[PDB]
Design a protein around this ligand. Structure first.
Ligand SMILES: [Cl-]
Ligand SMILES: [Cl-]
Ligand code: NA
Ligand code: NA
Length: 129
């Protein structure tokens, strides 16, 4: 599913991401824009052989099981394919664990390089939330 911007904002909001670990909703929408262009089916193969999955490009080296990431963990206790679903529940509940792992949203390199320090509130402009 390719979410609209405000559509994704509302779903993230409902699932409790707004202010999660102190990160405003616009930070999460910005991260999803640059991670997946709002496409739940996005996948990205990393140089280390792991893969990133879904709306927030969650990585198989630590967070989900894809059966093809040697030595990896599955700390969200899900198949990585769950991160590709049209319903973002699994991605959100896993993102909550990632953003709690010590470095906040810096876990998402795209967030650090493209969203951090910008006017992230613009990502929820116009949205009836
Ligand atoms: Cl915001
Ligand atoms: Cl594996
Ligand atoms: Na990524
Ligand atoms: Na894994």
């Amino acid at each position: 599913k390719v979410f609209g911007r405000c559509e994704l904002a509302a779903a993230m909001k409902r699932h409790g991401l707004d202010n999660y670990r102190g990160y405003s909703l616009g930070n999460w929408v910005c991260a999803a824009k640059f991670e997946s262009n709002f496409n739940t089916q996005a996948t990205n193969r990393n140089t280390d052989g792991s893969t990133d999955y879904g709306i927030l490009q969650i990585n198989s080296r630590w967070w989900c099981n894809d059966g093809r990431t040697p030595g990896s963990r599955n700390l969200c206790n899900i198949p990585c394919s769950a991160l590709l679903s049209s319903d973002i529940t699994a991605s959100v509940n896993c993102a909550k664990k990632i953003v709690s792992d010590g470095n906040g949203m810096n876990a998402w390199v795209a967030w650090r390089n493209r969203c951090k320090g910008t006017d992230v509130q613009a990502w929820i402009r116009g949205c009836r939330l």
